[model samples]
Target: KHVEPQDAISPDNYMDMLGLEARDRTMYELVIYRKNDKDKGPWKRYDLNGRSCYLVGRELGHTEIVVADIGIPEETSSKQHCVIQFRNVRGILKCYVMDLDSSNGTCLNNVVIPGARYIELRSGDVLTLSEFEEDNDYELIFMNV
Candidate 1:
């Protein structure tokens, strides 16, 4: 029989280290990059202070974290496009991505995701919004630290 390795940091302890209270939902940090932009250090980071984050194309309407308006022009994408919902289950941060029946669609690692379904997100997972190969598409780099 093979032995399994143990986690050095438990989920509860990790949450404690982050200074998260019981009432506080899991927070996520997103580093967004435009498909065509080459500026390396300027990739914008958004802090999802709440449990839910709505990703839109144009204006920043009720979106707590994502500010996609910086890189992609307003004319290129939809008004309300994709979303990423989060939960803190047993102290482990669970992040999920969903497409709100966007005009183009959302992609995960070069694969398109179905609308209204929840796709689990892990660290370093790149998420592209509004089509698989669009200039407006942005990659998501979840920051747990």
Candidate 2:
């Protein structure tokens, strides 16, 4: 009698099979704050749960977080500004960000980051897109819960 081989489990399917409760997932939030104004509340907020990647830009259909969605000017950001990636490193969830060669630039904690290079992010880290000018400067505070 011949026996059939078992099907291999894909990573996507494996995660599903484990169920939400069985896996240790990280919940992330990006709070947009205007650096020039401290009295005003957060300009916008993006919540991420169990998502591996998040795209940020001015384009409507090309990005997950659109700059215009939060009333940011179209010319202030690039079409594909940046990307935030998440991964499980040795059973621990880690977050990273990369600038997609935007017109202006992307900054991590007020320092400009190398384009297309992934930079590890931690809770309380700040992301700035474009030049640090009034009304044009915006901060995305990364956090995990």
**Number of the top-ranking candidate, with TM-score as the measure:** 2
Q: Where does model 1 exceed 4 Å of error?
A: 1-27, 60-74, 135-137
Clashing pairs in 2: none
lDDT of each: 0.59, 0.65
lDDT of 1 by residue, 21-136 (tens): 85664445777775567476536777654324445455534334455422334344555666666555555556677677777777787788888787887877877665647545
Worst 10 residues of 2 by lDDT: 1-10
TM-score of each: 0.63, 0.69
For model 2, the stretches where C-alpha displacement exceeds 4 angstroms are 1-26, 59-74, 131-135
Question: How large is the C-alpha RMSD of every model relative to the true structure?
Answer: 9.7, 9.2
In order of listing, the candidates' clash counts read 0, 0
lDDT of 2 by residue, 1-145 (tens): 1111133222233355557553464457888886678578887788755456677766435235544322333357776687777655554456777888888888788788898677899899988777554425567889875
Q: How close is candidate 1 to the true structure, as a TM-score?
A: 0.63
